[PDB]
Amino acid sequence: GGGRDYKDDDDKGTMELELRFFATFREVVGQKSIYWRVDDDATVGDVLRSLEAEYDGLAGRLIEDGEVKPHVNVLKNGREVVHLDGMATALDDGDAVSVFPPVAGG
Template identity: 30%
Template sequence: MSITVIIPTILRPLTHQQKHIDMEGSRVSEIIDHMDQQYPGIKEKLVANGNAHRFINIYVNDNDIRFQDGLATSLRDGDVLTILPAVAGG
């Protein structure tokens, strides 16, 4: 199952400056594990204590995974997974 992952600017140093990468996986968590094998260090930027990091937004197509099944959200061939760091502060 091929999924296109859109990489934000801040994580591109880990993906050799690639803006999108194609990954195989049937759940968001699998995609992140596979990315971490190819681009070590990326998982710790996205996942904390088994959940998506509070200030990292992950979307499958246009849907925020917080309102689906989080990292267990299932994927279909051709889906686009977008990672965007939240813009937040105090």
């Protein structure tokens, strides 16, 4: 079989995630919570990787050097993945990835 099956219906193995945006990231998307369709294997890092490919207002500020970003507050089922694996935590179907832009910690 061929690759790229990032849709609903038929075999594809894509899951659906509630991507909750807050602060700057919220007004960029213009939406405070959405439901995206990525593959089941795709994790929080792939999600924000793809998010900038859509939104110019998210470009660069959600990826730093292949990880999420210093000071950016990104979450996963309410658990802020900056304290754990940001790029590849545990993303399953019906989940909720919450995101906040990088905070001035000095």
